Design an enzyme around this catalytic site. Structure first.
Site, PDB file in Angstrom:
ATOM      1  CG  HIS A  22      -5.314   4.048   0.946  1.00 43.51           C
ATOM      2  ND1 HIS A  22      -4.954   2.717   0.916  1.00 43.51           N
ATOM      3  CD2 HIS A  22      -6.613   4.092   0.584  1.00 43.51           C
ATOM      4  CE1 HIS A  22      -5.992   1.989   0.550  1.00 43.51           C
ATOM      5  NE2 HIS A  22      -7.013   2.797   0.347  1.00 43.51           N
ATOM      6  CG  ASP A  58      -2.303   0.702   0.875  1.00 44.63           C
ATOM      7  OD1 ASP A  58      -2.371   1.942   0.882  1.00 44.63           O
ATOM      8  OD2 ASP A  58      -3.299  -0.003   0.622  1.00 44.63           O
ATOM      9  CB  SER A 101      -9.365   0.781  -0.259  1.00 42.79           C
ATOM     10  OG  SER A 101      -9.727   1.231  -1.573  1.00 42.79           O
TER      11      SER A 101
END
Ligand code: CA
Ligand code: CA
Ligand code: CA
Ligand code: CL
Length: 1380
Positions: free
Chosen positions: A102, A33, A423
């Site tokens: 994120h 990620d 996600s």
């Protein structure tokens, strides 16, 4: 210790596994990620000796001897971190909206473990708080070819360092399950066999159409679920919204007693412009009834405002607020759901609706700070964006749901925040997979690491809780849901799971007829036994009947029930389900004509007293043929002929406008105007074929006298409608697409006269937001009235047939046919009658030569302005000149005549013009053939076309002498500023037989010109390949009717017969003819074809007598890239620009204001400083033997200091520079292996670095690994120095070409058949049964030559052509016929 937030834990039932001894302990999750801040308070393990990785030192012992020496252990929690773009160890991102990350968020959700309180007073823990975290920083940006390289590394590195669970977050919409992206699948599959659960978010695209409208009920294949998650091995995760939300709410203290409104929550609106804290402690609410003006003298002013009535959102019912004062405004829904809402802002937000009416006291108000846990307005609902539908090849994915909506988790620098998306649901199943592995690792260590992760999946899925849509009280479709919602507890306790026929916790049945029949198998994992009673719900899509579109929901058909089973212990038991759906067929297929889904679940409760051992398995099939749903939308021509319209077609403005930018299926062509007073110098762009510029310049689909449009092209050379090409709106993913042309008498399409040289593949046009195209135009489908041999196909009536396949392995080819006229003939100009007293001009009734009809006639004269009949207009910003006539039009009476205002121009100076549906235009100038003795009495006036519309011809001044080779080519300079076409002319070619077929004007072809009083009978040109040394098989031949003159008939543009560019290399150009008397003659020449722009070095700059001198590096002259011209010039400013128009004999030509600098004897050029000309206006330019041209400003050649050097990286592909990969990334390392920092680029190429002198290496990091493959060394070393101060480094590559192959059969094959493709070299590529077409076996394959081998049992044979020679992007069907 502070309390734990359980908003998501209560709901997934995770504590049921913690208390049985399963936290994250002794395991580790690899999170691939965007970034972490491993310092965060949440980043910690409780006991380090319970853990898999035990210290900073257990790591380097695991890094080395597993084969890796980059990136480090950082602490006990985040156990490995490496930034795989740029190959560094900066892991944290980002250095209002600050602190957001994120990958930080993702990890917060899978692993724990904060013992401090977040803003709410609560401790937040992940689903496995005691697991250690490796984190691979891997994320894409399309400067590269393909990020797959970087993901596979991160994956392989994850499996080798500490395995367990990988969380991917990566996706490409509407993936397939079988023909996924091979090197990424094998890396995923490799991880499964190492006991790793690979879980992947499923996407935020939702369904075909999602940013436009709900999908039409004719198009059921609306699945957008992404690869790599659509693969069979991974766990594809759909996302449900959290019941509890954590935001910066509102509070009205006066509504604290009202307990269904949280005592003041309302959440917030704040869209586009989020200026919530602009003017916002607060007070002073208002109350407004109507959204008009001065409803009741307002009453606002430094007070919020309140309304709805959807009359005009965000403008008239928004900006109308700041009018009556009020310093801000507040909108409420007109139902209970809280929708989303230039800006035109003072301050605004949307707040509930049930809280609107509750604002009925005016009142006071406060805008809360800190975060206060409140109830979600979307609660137990499936998140809007979670991907859906089947895979592209028709498989049930996703697999499971988990909370993705408004999930509170970790942000950088000890912060927290909420972010929404699939996600986020994925790390929920990441942790859950950690725990269910501890469980199986305690419950059965008599279980192999190769079957483990498939069962972790199967436990999580069968034990999932089947979600029920709240707004509709119906089960949500399994295509949206998976096997249900995550039940962590159920998975670790029940010890029951379910597979279907396929041995998978889901069931995809393919097509279904009337009797749905499938075996279900329940498995038992403990010593105790269970007896369970089972029943199956049966669902289909609900469709709204007002508008005929699906509603993204379900409706229940009938709960059929089966009975009870009693699974054994440590054993299985199979069950058979059967349902007649023949009943519901009429009602459904009337609502959904092309078929519908028949899906649902079967449930398992414990017999006596259910709710113990609740487990389920989902299923889906298709009533109809899913393989054969329409791949493309129907053409806008057919749709409009009926009363229908396109899914994305905008019927705005005039009736039947098809503006070319408008998203339909149709045909596109090029337009070019026709001018009688000057030469046309540019074209008008694409437009939709069969549309024509109406009065107000909108493009209308005009009709012939019978009420039809006409698709007609005129493959003359004039650039008005000379070609046609397909533009599509695609409903399904496509494959195999080509254009073919047949004569229309060939009704079965068995004799292609022309095929598009390439075949095309691509994605459905799902338009999930603005970045995703609603139509795609495939210009490589251009047809131009030429055959497979280059011959002109004669005027006539033809079929342009676009054909293709969907991505389902047994589907049958879909065609789509366009009626097509080739008509190259101007309409007839004969005669008209003009009456000096009435002034009525009447031409004969309108006739055309050719099949296209006459589409319009007109009369016009040339309105002179500033002493010229045309208007030259210079676009300063885009450096473009255009020039067209000043045509003023004479209105047309209903009887077909014109009244000719002879006051505004003479009679000689009117033009009559008639144009046809294919673009041919005839124009007669009345003055031709008009008697000077006029002004008396009615006449018969002769009209002839004046050849105003014609194909332009190259200027030809050449005088051939015997000494001349006979070859000619063209010449042009390359513009530096202006974007017009530089004027070109013919030149001899008696040396340097090299061409750059790039249509730039300069050495683009090789023609032949003969001596003028010599005779060239039966002159043909043939071009042979280098290999063809007996000159037997031309690869290009002149068309019939070639001579010494009309050099165009001999001009070879570096192409094959079929119209595709030949490869770089050399070729035999053979001219043959017969004599004056009778002798045969054959001149042969070696033409060499090469693109590839020159590479310009830095040169150097010295100052001399106080003036700048530029000395270029010595150009090399050997080869095709050898330099034969060399210029230094500057651009003068005239009229304030650097280019200029000049009106000549012929017409207008555009040029750069070039002033050249001579060379000095010391090889330098003196760069004087002159008024208004800076160094950015001085250019160095070079031309090679081939005609290839590069240039650079002299300003750009400095910034290379005299002590510094330049390295340029590029790929060397053996194809034309228009079919090449250009995207790749590279890492340069200095003499110590440290990556170089602080990059300076050279001559504006991101592939060219300025660097100090030294030793270096470059590494090819990424390229499009599907498009091409690397053949030279991946790491190259180089040294820069004053002698070698410019360095070329080249990565040599080959192109990759794939094809699909399907073996289709007579009848099914007996049990025990094994179909395989047999490669030349003997190896076997195993094939598998198609799900929807079970007599088909197919695979996508590398372009090569294959044989189908089957190997049947006990005696049958195959009896057919089993061999195929594959072509690139084609689909090959090999129908085969077994017999006994
Ligand atoms: Ca999909
Ligand atoms: Ca034409
Ligand atoms: Ca050229
Ligand atoms: Cl015509």
């Amino acid at each position: 210790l502070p309390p734990v937030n359980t908003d998501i834990h209560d709901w997934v039932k995770t504590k049921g596994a913690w208390d049985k001894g399963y936290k994250g302990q002794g395991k580790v999750v690899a999170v691939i990620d965007t970034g972490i801040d491993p310092a965060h308070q949440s980043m910690r393990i409780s006991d380090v000796s319970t853990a898999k990785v035990k210290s900073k030192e257990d790591m380097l012992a695991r890094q080395k001897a597993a084969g890796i020496n980059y990136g480090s252990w950082i602490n006990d929690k985040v156990v490995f971190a490496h930034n795989y773009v740029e190959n560094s160890d900066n892991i944290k991102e980002n250095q209002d909206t600050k602190y957001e990350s994120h990958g930080m968020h993702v990890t917060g959700i899978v692993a724990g473990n904060s013992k401090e309180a977040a803003a709410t007073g609560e401790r937040f823990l992940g689903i496995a708080p005691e697991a250690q975290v490796m984190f691979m920083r891997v994320f894409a940006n399309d400067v590269m070819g393909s990020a797959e390289s970087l993901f596979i590394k991160a994956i392989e590195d994850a499996v080798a360092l500490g395995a367990d669970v990988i969380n991917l977050s990566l996706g490409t919409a509407n993936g397939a399950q079988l023909s996924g992206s091979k090197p990424l699948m094998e890396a995923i599959e490799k991880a499964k066999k190492a006991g790793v659960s690979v879980v992947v978010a499923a996407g935020n695209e939702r369904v075909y159409g999602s940013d436009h409208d709900d999908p039409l009920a004719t198009n059921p294949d609306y699945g957008l679920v992404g690869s790599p998650s659509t693969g069979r091995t991974p766990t594809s995760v759909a996302a449900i919204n959290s019941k509890w939300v954590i935001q910066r709410l509102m509070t009205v203290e006066e509504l604290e007693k009202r307990a269904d409104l949280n005592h003041g929550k309302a959440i917030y609106s704040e869209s586009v412009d989020f200026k919530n804290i602009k003017d916002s402690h607060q007070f002073a609410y208002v109350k407004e009834s109507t959204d008009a003006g001065y409803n009741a003298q307002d009453v606002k002013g430094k007070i919020a405002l309140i309304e709805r009535d959807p009359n005009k959102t965000y403008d008239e019912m928004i900006a109308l607020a700041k009018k009556h004062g009020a310093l801000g405004v507040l909108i409420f829904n007109n139902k209970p759901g809280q929708s989303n809402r230039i800006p035109s802002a003072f301050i605004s937000h949307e707040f509930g609706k049930a809280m609107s009416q509750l604002n009925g006291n005016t009142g006071s108000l406060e805008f809360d700070s800190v975060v206060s846990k409140a109830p979600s307005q979307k609660g137990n609902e499936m998140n809007h964006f979670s991907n859906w539908g089947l895979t592209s090849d028709g498989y049930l994915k996703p697999d499971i749901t988990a909370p993705g909506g408004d999930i509170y988790s970790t942000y950088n620098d000890n912060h927290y925040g909420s972010q929404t998306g699939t996600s986020m649901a994925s790390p929920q199943i990441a942790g859950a997979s950690l725990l269910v592995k501890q469980y199986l690792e305690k419950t059965q260590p008599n279980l192999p690491k190769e079957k483990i992760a498939d069962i972790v999946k199967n436990l999580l899925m069968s034990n999932a809780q089947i979600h029920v849509n709240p707004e509709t009280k119906t089960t949500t479709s399994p295509r949206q849901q998976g096997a249900g919602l995550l039940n962590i507890d159920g998975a670790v306790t029940s010890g029951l799971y379910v597979t279907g026929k396929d041995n998978y916790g889901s069931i995809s049945l393919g097509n279904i007829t009337d009797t749905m029949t499938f075996d279900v198998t329940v498995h038992n994992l403990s010593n105790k036994d269970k007896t369970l009673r089972y029943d199956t719900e049966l669902l289909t899509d609900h469709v709204d009947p007002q508008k005929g579109r699906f509603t993204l929901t379900s409706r229940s058909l009938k709960t059929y029930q089966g009975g009870e089973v009693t699974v054994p212990a440590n054993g299985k038991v199979t069950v058979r389900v059967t349902m007649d759906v023949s009943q519901f067929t009429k009602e459904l297929t009337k609502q959904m004509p092309n078929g519908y889904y028949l899906e649902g679940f079967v449930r398992f409760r414990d017999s006596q007293d259910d709710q113990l051992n609740r487990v389920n398995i989902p299923f889906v099939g298709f009533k109809g043929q899913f393989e054969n749903l329409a791949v493309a939308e129907e053409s806008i021509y057919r749709l409009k002929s009926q009363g229908k319209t396109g899914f994305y077609f905008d019927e705005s403005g005039p009736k039947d406008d098809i503006y070319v930018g408008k998203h339909f299926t149709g045909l596109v062509t090029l337009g070019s105007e026709t001018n009688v007073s000057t030469k046309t110098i540019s074209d008008n762009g694409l437009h939709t074929l069969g549309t024509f510029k109406n009065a107000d310049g909108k493009f209308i689909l005009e009709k012939n006298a019978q009420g039809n449009p006409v698709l007609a092209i005129s493959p003359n050379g004039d650039n008005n409608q000379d070609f046609a090409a397909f533009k599509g709106v695609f409903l399904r993913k496509y494959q195999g697409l080509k254009a073919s042309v047949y004569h229309a008498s060939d009704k079965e399409h068995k004799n292609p006269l022309w095929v598009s040289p390439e075949s095309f593949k691509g994605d459905k046009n799902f338009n999930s937001d603005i970045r995703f195209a609603k139509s795609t135009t495939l210009l490589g489908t251009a047809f131009s009235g030429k055959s497979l041999t280059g011959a002109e196909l004669p005027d006539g009536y033809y079929h342009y047939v676009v054909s293709y396949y969907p991505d389902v392995v047994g589907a049958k080819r879909q065609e789509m046919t366009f009626d097509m006229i080739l008509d190259r003939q101007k309409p007839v100009l004969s005669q008209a009658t003009f009456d000096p007293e009435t002034n009525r001009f009447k031409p004969e009734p309108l006739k055309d030569r050719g099949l296209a009809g006459v589409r319009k006639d007109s009369v016009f004269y040339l309105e002179r302005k500033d002493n010229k009949p045309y208007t030259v207009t210079i676009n300063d910003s885009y450096k473009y000149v255009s020039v067209e006539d000043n045509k003023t039009f004479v209105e047309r009476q209903a009887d077909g005549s014109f009244i000719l205002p002879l006051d505004k121009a003479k009679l000689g100076d009117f033009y009559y013009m008639v144009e046809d549906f294919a673009g041919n235009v005839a124009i007669a100038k009345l003055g031709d053939h008009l008697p000077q003795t006029l002004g008396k009495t009615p006449i018969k006036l002769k009209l002839t076309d004046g050849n105003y519309q014609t194909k332009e011809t190259l200027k030809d001044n050449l005088e051939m002498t015997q000494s001349d080779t006979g070859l000619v080519t063209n010449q042009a300079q390359l513009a530096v500023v202006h974007r017009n076409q530089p004027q070109s002319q013919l030149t001899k070619m008696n040396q340097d037989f090299f061409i750059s077929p790039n249509e730039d004007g300069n050495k683009d072809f090789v023609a032949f010109k003969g001596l003028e009083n010599n005779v060239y009978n039966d002159l043909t040109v043939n071009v042979y390949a280098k290999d063809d040394h007996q000159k037997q098989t031309p690869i290009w031949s002149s068309q019939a009717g070639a001579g010494a003159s009309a050099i165009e008939s001999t001009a070879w543009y570096g192409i094959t017969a079929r119209g595709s560019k030949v490869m770089p290399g050399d070729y035999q150009y053979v001219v043959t003819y017969r004599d004056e008397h009778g002798k045969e003659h054959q001149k042969q020449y070696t033409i060499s074809v090469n693109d590839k722009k020159p590479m310009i070095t830095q040169g150097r700059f010295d100052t001399i007598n106080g003036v700048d001198h530029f000395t270029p590096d010595k150009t090399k002259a050997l080869g095709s890239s050898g330099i034969v011209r060399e210029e230094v010039f500057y651009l003068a400013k005239k009229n304030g620009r650097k280019f200029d128009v000049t009106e000549g004999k012929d017409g207008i030509t555009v040029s750069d204001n070039k002033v050249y600098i001579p060379k000095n004897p010391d090889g330098s050029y003196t760069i004087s400083k002159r008024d208004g000309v800076t160094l950015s206006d001085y250019y160095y330019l070079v031309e090679d033997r081939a005609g290839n041209v590069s240039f650079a400003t002299l300003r750009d050649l400095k910034a290379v200091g005299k002590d510094k050097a330049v390295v340029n990286f590029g790929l060397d592909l053996p194809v034309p520079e228009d079919k090449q990969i250009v995207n790749f990334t590279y890492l340069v390392r200095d003499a110590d292996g440290k990556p170089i920092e602080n990059l300076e680029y050279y001559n504006n190429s991101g592939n060219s670095l300025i660097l100090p002198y030294g030793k270096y290496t470059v590494e090819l990091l990424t390229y499009d690994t599907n498009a091409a493959k690397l053949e030279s060394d991946k790491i190259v070393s180089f040294t820069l120095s004053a002698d070698n101060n410019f360095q070329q480094v080249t990565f040599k590559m080959t192109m990759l070409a794939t094809s699909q192959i399907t073996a289709h059969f007579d009848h099914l094959l007996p049990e025990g058949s094994r179909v395989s493709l047999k490669t030349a070299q003997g190896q076997l590529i195993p094939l598998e049964q198609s799900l929807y077409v079970p007599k088909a076996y197919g695979k996508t394959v590398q372009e090569g030559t294959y044989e189908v081998v089957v190997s049947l049992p006990k005696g049958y044979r195959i009896e057919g052509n089993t061999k195929v020679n594959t072509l690139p992007n084609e689909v090959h069907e090999l129908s085969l016929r077994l017999v006994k």
